[PDB]
Amino acid sequence: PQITLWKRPLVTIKIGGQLKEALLDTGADDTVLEEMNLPGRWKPKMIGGIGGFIKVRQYDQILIEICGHKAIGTVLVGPTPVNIIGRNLLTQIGCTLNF
Amino acid sequence: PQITLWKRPLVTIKIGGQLKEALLDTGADDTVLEEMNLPGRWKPKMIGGIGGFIKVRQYDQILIEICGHKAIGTVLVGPTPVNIIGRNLLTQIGCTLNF
């Protein structure tokens, strides 16, 4: 679908068998979700935003469905202000910017 | 044009007679640019993201040209690591997400 930007581009995602709201964020290299219990192994990593760096748990090769589109990639879990879908997954669902 | 997301969506912009590179950021509510000396009045503001908040200067009715598309609106200026074009100006250039 085509999404205009008058409102935040929020969509429903399905990760680990749970539905969640997430922001499509072309300014994010990586996907970062709020604190949650995910199955599988994870490694501690650091990521930096506009206001500094935070500690996150890195889950690799996680299945995540975004508006009925399947992706399998890296998902970071930590104290992000909001669930964001970054380019690592936006590329997988075929997302482009157009103007 | 159509911008894929394999790499950061960086484009050339023109503001206050200066050319800069900036990120087309659907996750940013408002445009925030690196520290620069813009004339005119401004209002202090704080904006939040990963890592916390930064203090910025809010300028209103600022003209920016993005890839030849003109747009006028709020421009925040502060210690951001990257120039960010946010939804407030992305809507004005007819920019959409598509997948």
Ligand SMILES: CCC(CC)CN(C[C@@H](O)[C@H](Cc1ccccc1)NC(=O)O[C@H]1CO[C@H]2OCC[C@H]21)S(=O)(=O)c1ccc(N)cc1
């Ligand atoms: C509240 C929703 C997001 C943060 C979650 C808002 N951000 C825009 C976002 O695109 C930001 C924009 C951004 C890009 C690059 C450096 C700092 C900020 N990218 C970002 O934080 O991405 C992180 C996750 O992927 C990684 O790649 C980029 C950093 C990591 S922001 O920078 O903090 C921001 C907040 C308010 C305004 N008005 C303008 C920008």
